[PDB]
Design a protein around this ligand. Structure first.
Ligand code: CLA
Ligand code: CLA
Ligand code: CLA
Ligand code: CLA
Ligand code: CLA
Ligand code: CLA
Ligand code: CLA
Ligand code: CLA
Ligand SMILES: CCCCCCCCCCCCCCCC(=O)OC[C@H](COP(=O)(O)OC[C@@H](O)CO)OC(=O)CCCCCCCCCCCCCCC
Ligand SMILES: CC1=C(C/C=C(\C)CCC[C@H](C)CCC[C@H](C)CCCC(C)C)C(=O)c2ccccc2C1=O
Ligand code: SF4
Ligand code: SF4
Lengths: 139, 30, 62, 37, 161, 80, 131, 739
């Protein structure tokens, strides 16, 4: 789970983050264990310091979580980032890793959502699907 | 005399009315 | 049946190299759909030179 | 250096330097050629 | 006399352009020292003007009411030197540069590295295509008849339909 | 949300998944071969529509397509 | 922490002026805080109209300037009515339940702005043409 | 400590064959035609392909030698064409009457009509570069001294070009030779700037002051002794300012008051020429030298004494600003771009200061009466300055993407500006909108008032007045400052604030530029247009790494066009695209500054003086009531003063008329690239590759459309070139005819 409360990094700043959208619906939180006391750029402004931790950071967008979750895998090789999205004034817990593994890795039990059993040149003309509820790419 | 009454009616007053019903029709919800 | 090194013409109408000549680099010896790998002299807009086609999209102009 | 002069910007320039100077010297001895006489 | 255009030898507006061009240079000459170097450059400019009015009078050009030589392209052979004769003189030169760069690219494309030889130009193959480019009105005739000047549409790449 | 459809000319290259900035995509085993993979989009509500998954697909005229549909707050990429 | 902590952030010298203005003041009802807001803004709004007007050296300029400023307040009554018609639809409750968050008093606030706005426009007409 | 490497790079032509040799991305061959533009884009960006800061900095050092070569080559051409193809000898005899000229035009197709009646017995182009007035202040009287200086620059150009070969191929210094900023600041201050102003102070005393003392006595440029005779013959230097007879004994015994005749503080304009007194500028650079030589002994070196710039920043920290300047020295001795942007900011900010200080205090003799040059000298250095300030916001943004390190910057003054950037940008956002309403709308108000027949309701001097009292006061404290607070000065710092009309020839050299209601409006137009230009560039710097929109904008790069059509559409989000947008606004800002200048002087300042003393200006004092409306800017400035750039066909000014229309073309041609987008042309070219593939001759280098980033770049390049060269042609054809 989210394990809130967990210690925010030693930061103190950033006008650019977590405004009034967060309190009404859907903010996010990325949780990781940083194996140093080192500085890292935030998507808001740049520094904080990562704790020994159990480190947690409440971010506004999921796009800002995967951007920070890419920096911890690139620069510090801590790939244990585990993002969430909150409860009653939020929507959906445990966004990533969604099936216990990274999405670039294969995992059996996943189902091919959004797959098509055809090419793109085999897409029909929109005149054939005119005045119907079908769309020219759905199957 | 009728120009002096009609042109501030549809120059000022009548746009301010139709702006009001539109702005309520936009930001209402079912 | 196309073999490796054969100079083919592409009939895939969506492809960048439609109705153009390319040489098959290899074919996959399994039942995988689109096994025919053709290498082209001309790069597409993503600057690549290969693609996987089927045998229905290629011919044997040799 | 000869393989440098075969490159496109230099050989695009010296031939354009040649073809301009062709046209420049023509208008000095044959000025104001409107029509074929 | 094809559109009310009087010839320039009897056109008085054209003969009056000369009277004002030299009067605008003689007054430019009237202040300078007579033996000076800007003095002789104005007489070289005055006589270069007289070599274009006498060149246009004797050539049989057509001057309007303004007095400027008009050109007549419907092509008549009495006015053939305006557009028809330098146009034919153009078309060989442009087709020379055209067929040279086309013959260069067909020779280069059937090599090991074709894109390399477009950057650095092979002076053997460049001067070869000049030799194949001078004969282009003859060379394109047997090229079009042989069937290898154009390509059929199953060989070119074409957008989807 | 924007619609993301993955076509069968994919090769299991895994490049569009790791180029996704909002973690929409994932890799899944294939039915008819049970060895190769294909991309899949189970989280299309997160899709901003940046089309970075199309810039990474190596196939000629890419196997994954993004059709920009209705714009929610996630797909508009709004921090407010 | 998400908010930046400058030395003048959360200063009591300006957090006491915010807590005592008639938009955040605790004791007021929406009829009263619309009157206090309306009395302040209508008082200065007739300022620029009488000294910077299309007619300023007339009989004539103090009345028509103040006639213009009550023209703004009757426009801005509609804007406060339209903002309440839109943002409080069904009197949409929220997490704070103030006049600004949920509606809950809003029809009185616009009339309070109407009374104090048209008052101080006319009140400052007295101190300029007379007094 | 000098440390170098011996022969790291050979002097071969193996890499002259292959274009693109430097990068792993290039030199494989152009598969498409973007490679031709990818090559010319990332050549002199050494930081991308070379990943060693030692190897990068050697390329940068020896490349400035090549740029030092081309300036010296350009300077020799300035001196050669003054020697051979100029009327400089005849001009010194009559400097007011004869127009300065170089660049004779060849007798070919008709461009020998540009060789006009320029003065005396010479025919050429009336030039507006001020080299005739610069060489007269240097003391030059014959063309042989120009001819040897043209040779002297070419040998110096070869000397710099050899030094760039030597210091990269043969003896390339290490990284530690470049990171020594304190010894570099010591050397450039006292040596480059101090001795450069000390040695030039030697020229103005021994050479410039003696010949100008006889030239302003007006004998002849032939009767005047050659300037080596003022060094040899000490009786000749004694008949003019007789204080040279005492030698250097007033200098070493500190009895400097004996130099009161060639080291003055006269401080005005010469009544014979209309330039600054040369004995002022002789005393000037001598005082500048000692301030620069003394300041060059400040920073620490290997001798213990001296300031350390790393320990000045440590313990310059307050309670507002966290860790202070700790880290900005380590940033500045590693980032070549943060060094470039700051040195570009104050090079371009200086270049506008040079323009403002040279029309009001004309340094050269007969520069003030030469209205044809003083306007072009202003408008040049303003335009040069604004390009460099955009390069400051450019290279500050390139610093943020790859040279910014978050580990080195925690709670310092780079971190704390990148943490409240939403407060900086939005408060900058408001102050443009406040200034755009309250400066441009006061013109829109004045248009509407004069259109409606209401001239008593606009902002004017016979209307609602907006007098500039904060600037009119500063005109008062600087016009009444000679004798009270600068007591040794005989006259004021300039005649622009207040003073007499200095009339050299029949024309005004300088007169007090008054300030009124119109001057309040334009100076707030300038305040507005600058603040938007700051706003675009500073938004590019502070958001170069990330935003709320794209949190990994530094992972994508400094120069990338978009992140796609998602997030609503993310076109022009990068740091490069803010530099691209700021270029127009810099063009928008500076072109009003040059329109303000060109009509302020023509109406109120520049003009003729009659034999009694009354002044009749050029445009006749129509800036006061015309330049408060946009129609008066259109009718009385752009329409009324372009009557010389269009009536110039058939005269000697005809190439200004052809450059006028020819720059309207390139400006309007640029909108083809700016307004449109790439993917139209990539499918238009697909119809043209077909019509070449039909006849079997399509090139193997595949044709592509220009990229999105290039199409923006090729559109802003022709936009500025189209509008500056229109302003070039309009300014030149106007002031040559009337001034
Ligand atoms: C298109 C319709 C329209 C019409 C008919 C007018 C008419 C007027 N405008 Mg204009 N104005 C308009 C649109 C219009 N405006 C737009 C679109 C702009 C933006 C460009 C402006 C910008 C503008 C400015 C800046 C000013 C005007 C002013 C005026 C007045 C000039 C004559 C005058 O002073 O009488 C003398 C009469 C008076 C001074 C008082 C008139 C009565 C007031 C406005 C209403 C009284 C309140 C009433 C109880 C209820 C409100 C009714 C009201 C909404 C109609 C006149 C009433 C001047 C003005 O006085 O503004 C008020 C002025 O300074 N206008
Ligand atoms: C680009 C090709 C080109 C061609 C075909 C010519 C051709 C010619 N030049 Mg020219 N010349 C050129 C470029 C060219 N020039 C350039 C670029 C310059 C500037 C350096 C000159 C400077 C020049 C001078 C000074 C003279 C010639 C002269 C001549 C003519 C005599 C033959 C000769 O070579 O000497 C011949 C028509 C001569 C001539 O006959 O003039 C009457 C002559 O005196 N040329
Ligand atoms: C594209 C339209 C166009 C056309 C049809 C022409 C045609 C002509 N111009 Mg014009 N001109 C043009 C554009 C054009 N020009 C442009 C864009 C400019 C500004 C740069 C000028 C400025 C200009 C001037 C100042 C003069 C001309 C002259 C001429 C005449 C050429 C005289 C000559 O000796 O050439 C004959 C050339 C040959 C016999 C050699 C042909 C082989 C060459 C070397 C091939 C080069 C290919 C590269 C010819 C009628 C001259 C004239 O005669 O006025 C009446 C003249 O003095 N032109
Ligand atoms: C003259 C003998 C000579 C030779 C044979 C070389 C050879 C080499 N140099 Mg060296 N070098 C030299 C002199 C020489 N250099 C000089 C005089 C300088 C000082 C400028 C340098 C400074 C230098 C640097 C910093 C670098 C090299 C590099 C190189 C290597 C590759 C360069 C290349 O292939 O592009 C050839 C380049 C050109 C032909 C373009 C030259 C552009 C000139 C200098 C200016 C042109 C601008 C001009 C004013 C045009 C204005 C616009 C116009 C329309 C008016 C190659 C071994 C590179 C290297 O070793 O990489 C590992 C490298 O980074 N050189
Ligand atoms: C700063 C760069 C520069 C520029 C833009 C010019 C420009 C010019 N020079 Mg100058 N010149 C320069 C530096 C420059 N010069 C230097 C450094 C020298 C000493 C080496 C000269 C020595 C010189 C002479 C002796 C002459 C010129 C001439 C010219 C004019 C004709 C162009 C030409 O003949 O090219 C020819 C084309 C090529 C050389 C291409 C190969 C043109 C205005 C000519 C002139 O003005 O005639 C009245 C002329 O006679 N120049
Ligand atoms: C007092 C001796 C002295 C003098 C007169 C100069 C003068 C100069 N140096 Mg400096 N330089 C010096 C010592 C000196 N340097 C020392 C001791 C160092 C190393 C600590 C440097 C490191 C240095 C670099 C890296 C550069 C200069 C550059 C320059 C030139 C500036 C451009 C200009 O305005 O013209 C100028 C010639 C610039 C230049 O033009 O390089 C070619 C440049 O890029 N210098
Ligand atoms: C910095 C450059 C510079 C140089 C190279 C010179 C060089 C010279 N000065 Mg000058 N001078 C200079 C700046 C310079 N001066 C400055 C800044 C002042 C004002 C303080 C003077 C004031 C001055 C006087 C009054 C005299 C010289 C004289 C001399 C000459 C003999 C002095 C000597 O070398 O022992 C020598 C040519 C003497 C001379 O020969 O004048 C003709 C002489 O009488 N100088
Ligand atoms: C002349 C054309 C033009 C105009 C009017 C504008 C206007 C503006 N630009 Mg734009 N811009 C332009 C060309 C123009 N730009 C071009 C060609 C480019 C491409 C390079 C840009 C790229 C660009 C950038 C990158 C930025 C701007 C910004 C701005 C805004 C500056 C804020 C301000 O002071 O507003 C003041 C408003 C005016 C001066 C308009 C005058 C109108 C009068 C005063 C009022 C209107 C009368 C009346 C009340 C109308 C209402 C009545 C009606 C509804 C009935 C302003 C809206 C900046 C911004 O938005 O930051 C805040 C910014 O960063 N622009
Ligand atoms: C303005 C005067 C000013 O700069 O005060 C100075 C003050 C910094 O004071 P300190 O002594 O904390 O500064 C130490 C370093 O800034 C320089 O030594 O600036 C700030 O607090 C930021 C200003 C924000 C700018 C607000 C507008
Ligand atoms: C016109 C245009 C193009 C097409 C322009 C192209 C493809 C540039 C090609 C023109 C040059 C002039 C081709 C040069 C070809 C050779 C170098 C010519 C050599 C001749 C020698 C004699 C020198 C774009 O690609 C584009 C992209 C994005 C936004 C706007 C635009 C845009 O406006
Ligand atoms: S991006 Fe496309 S081609 Fe690449 S692995 Fe995914 S589905 Fe296959
Ligand atoms: S459009 Fe962007 S966010 Fe959506 S699936 Fe593709 S890469 Fe991921």
């Amino acid at each position: 789970t989210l394990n809130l409360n967990a210690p925010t990094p030693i930061f103190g700043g950033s006008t650019g983050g977590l405004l009034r959208k967060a309190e009404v619906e859907e903010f996010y939180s990325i949780t990781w264990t940083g194996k140093s006391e080192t500085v890292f750029e935030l998507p808001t402004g740049g520094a904080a310091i990562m704790r020994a931790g159990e480190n947690l950071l409440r971010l506004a967008r999921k796009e800002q979580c995967i951007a920070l979750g890419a920096q911890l895998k690139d620069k510090f090789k801590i790939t244990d980032y585990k993002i969430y999205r909150v409860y009653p004034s939020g929507e959906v817990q445990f966004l990533h890793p969604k099936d216990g593994v990274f999405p670039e890795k294969v995992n059996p039990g996943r189902v091919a959502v959004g797959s098509n059993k055809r090419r793109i040149g085999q897409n029909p003309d929109p005149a054939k699907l005119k005045f119907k509820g079908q769309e020219t790419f759905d199957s | 005399n009728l120009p002096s009454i009609l042109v501030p009616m549809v120059g000022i007053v009548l746009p301010a009315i139709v702006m009001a019903l539109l702005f309520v029709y936009i930001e209402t919800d079912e | 049946m196309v073999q490796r090194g054969s100079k083919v013409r592409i009939l895939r109408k969506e492809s960048y190299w439609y109705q153009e000549i390319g040489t098959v680099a290899s074919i996959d010896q399994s039942g995988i759909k689109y096994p025919v790998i053709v290498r082209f002299e001309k790069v597409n807009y993503s600057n690549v030179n290969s693609n996987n086609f089927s045998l229905d999209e290629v011919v044997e102009v040799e | 250096f000869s393989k440098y002069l075969s490159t496109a910007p230099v050989i695009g320039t010296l031939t354009a330097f040649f073809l301009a100077g062709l046209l420049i010297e023509i208008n000095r001895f044959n000025p104001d050629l409107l029509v074929y006489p | 006399d094809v559109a009310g255009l009087i010839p320039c030898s009897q056109s008085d507006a054209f003969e009056r352009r000369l009277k004002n061009t030299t009067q605008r240079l003689e007054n430019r000459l009237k202040k300078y020292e007579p033996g000076s170097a800007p003095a002789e450059a104005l007489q070289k400019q005055i006589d270069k003007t007289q070599q274009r009015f006498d060149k246009y009078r004797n050539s049989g050009l057509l001057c309007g009411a303004d007095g400027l030589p008009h050109l007549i392209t419907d092509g008549r052979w009495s006015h053939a030197g305006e557009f028809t004769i330098p146009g034919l003189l153009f078309l060989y030169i442009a087709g020379f540069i055209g067929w040279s760069g086309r013959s260069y690219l067909q020779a280069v494309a059937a090599s090991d590295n074709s894109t390399e030889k477009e950057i650095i130009i092979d002076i053997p193959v460049a001067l070869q295509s000049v030799s194949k480019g001078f004969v282009w009105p003859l060379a394109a005739l047997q090229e079009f008849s042989s069937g290898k000047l154009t390509a059929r549409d199953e060989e070119i790449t074409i957008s989807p339909r | 949300a924007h619609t993301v459809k993955i076509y069968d000319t994919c090769i299991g290259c895994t490049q569009c998944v790791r180029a996704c900035p909002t973690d929409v995509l994932e890799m899944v085993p294939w039915d008819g071969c049970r060895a190769n993979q294909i991309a899949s989009a189970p989280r299309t509500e997160d899709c901003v529509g940046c089309k970075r998954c199309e810039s990474a697909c190596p196939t000629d005229f890419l196997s994954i397509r993004v059709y920009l549909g209705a714009e929610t707050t996630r797909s508009m990429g709004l921090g407010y | 922490i998400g908010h930046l902590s400058t030395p003048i952030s959360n200063s009591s010298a300006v957090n006491g002026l915010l807590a005592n203005l008639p938009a955040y003041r605790k004791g007021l009802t929406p009829r009263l805080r619309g009157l206090e807001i309306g009395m302040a803004h209508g008082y200065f709004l007739t300022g620029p109209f009488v000294e910077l007007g299309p007619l300023r050296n007339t009989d004539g300029g103090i009345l028509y300037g103040s006639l213009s400023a009550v023209g703004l307040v009757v426009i801005l009554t509609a804007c406060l009515a339209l903002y309440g018609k839109a943002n409080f639809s069904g009197s949409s409750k929220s997490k704070d339940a103030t006049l600004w968050e949920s509606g809950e008093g809003w029809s009185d606030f616009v009339s309070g702005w109407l009374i104090g706005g048209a008052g101080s426009v006319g009140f400052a007409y007295l101190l300029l043409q007379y007094i | 400590k000098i440390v170098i490497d011996k022969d790291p790079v050979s002097t071969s032509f193996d890499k002259w064959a292959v274009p693109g040799h430097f990068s792993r991305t290039l030199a494989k061959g152009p598969k498409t035609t973007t490679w031709i533009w990818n090559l010319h884009a990332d050549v002199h960006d050494f930081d991308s392909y070379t990943s060693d800061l030692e190897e990068v900095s050697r390329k940068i050092f020896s490349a400035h030698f090549g740029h030092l070569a081309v300036v010296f080559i350009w300077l020799s051409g300035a001196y050669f064409h003054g020697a051979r193809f100029s009327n400089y000898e005849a001009w010194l005899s009559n400097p007011t009457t004869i127009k300065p000229s170089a660049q004779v035009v060849w007798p070919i197709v008709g461009q020998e009509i540009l060789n006009g009646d320029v003065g005396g017995g010479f025919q050429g182009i009336q030039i507006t570069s001020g080299l005739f007035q610069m060489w007269r202040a240097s003391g030059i009287t014959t063309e042989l001294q120009l001819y040897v200086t043209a040779i002297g620059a070419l040998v110096m150009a070869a000397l710099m070009l050899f030094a760039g070969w030597f210091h990269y191929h043969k003896a390339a210094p290490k990284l530690e030779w470049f990171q020594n900023a304190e010894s570099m600041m010591n050397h450039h201050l006292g040596g480059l700037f101090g001795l450069g102003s000390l040695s030039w102070a030697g020229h103005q005393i021994h050479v410039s002051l003696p010949v100008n003392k006889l030239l302003d006595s007006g004998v002849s440029p032939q009767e005047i002794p050659l300037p080596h005779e003022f060094i040899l013959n000490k009786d000749l230097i004694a008949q003019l300012y007789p204080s040279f007879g005492q030698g250097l004994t007033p200098f070493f015994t500190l009895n400097w008051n004996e130099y009161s005749d060639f080291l003055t503080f006269k401080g005005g304009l010469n009544p014979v020429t209309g330039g600054l007194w040369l004995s002022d500028s002789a005393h000037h650079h001598l005082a500048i030298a000692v301030l620069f030589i003394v300041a060059g002994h400040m920073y620490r070196t290997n001798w213990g004494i001296g300031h350390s710039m790393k320990e000045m920043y440590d313990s310059h920290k307050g309670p507002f600003t966290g860790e202070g300047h700790k880290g900005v020295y380590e940033i500045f001795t590693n980032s070549w771009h943060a060094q470039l942007s700051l040195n570009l900011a104050l090079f371009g900010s200086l270049s506008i200061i040079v323009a403002h200080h040279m029309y009001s205090m004309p340094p050269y003799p007969y520069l003030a009466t030469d209205y044809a040059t003083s306007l072009c000298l202003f408008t040049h250095h303003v335009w040069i300055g604004g390009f460099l300030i955009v390069g400051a916001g450019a290279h500050a943004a390139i610093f943020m993407v790859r040279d910014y390190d978050p580990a080195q910057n925690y709670n310092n003054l780079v971190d704390r500006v990148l943490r409240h950037r939403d407060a900086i940008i939005s408060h900058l956002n408001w102050v443009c909108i406040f200034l755009g309403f309250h400066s441009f709308g006061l013109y829109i108000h004045n248009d509407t008032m004069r259109a409606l027949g209401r001239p008593q309701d606009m902002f004017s001097d016979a209307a609602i007045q907006l007098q500039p009292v904060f600037a009119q006061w500063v005109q008062g404290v600087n016009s009444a400052a000679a004798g009270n607070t600068a007591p040794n000065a005989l006259a004021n710092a300039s005649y622009a604030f207040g003073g007499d009309i200095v009339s050299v020839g029949g024309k005004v050299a300088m007169m007090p530029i008054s300030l009124g209601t119109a001057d309040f409006l334009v100076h707030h137009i300038h305040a507005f247009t600058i603040h938007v230009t700051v706003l675009i560039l500073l938004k590019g710097v502070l958001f170069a790494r990330n935003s709320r929109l794209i949190p990994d904008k530094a992972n994508l790069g400094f120069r990338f066009p978009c992140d796609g059509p998602g997030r609503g559409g993310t076109c022009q989000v990068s740091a490069w695209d803010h530099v691209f947008l700021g270029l127009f606004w810099m063009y928008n800002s500076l072109s009003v500054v040059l329109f303000h200048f060109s009509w302020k002087m023509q109406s109120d300042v520049w003009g003729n003086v009659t034999a009694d003393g009354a002044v009749s200006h050029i445009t006749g004092n129509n800036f006061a009531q015309g330049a408060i409306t946009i129609n008066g800017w259109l009718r009385d400035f752009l329409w009324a003063q372009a009557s010389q750039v269009i009536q110039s066909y058939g005269s000697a000014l005809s190439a200004y008329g052809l450059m006028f229309l020819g720059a309207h073309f390139i400006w309007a041609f640029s909108l083809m690239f700016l307004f449109s987008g790439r993917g139209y042309w990539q499918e238009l070219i697909e119809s043209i590759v077909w019509a070449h593939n039909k006849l079997k001759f399509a090139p193997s280098i595949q044709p592509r459309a220009l990229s999105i980033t290039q199409g923006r770049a090729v559109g802003v390049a022709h936009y500025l070139l189209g509008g500056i060269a229109t302003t070039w042609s309009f300014f030149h054809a106007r002031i040559i005819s009337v001034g």
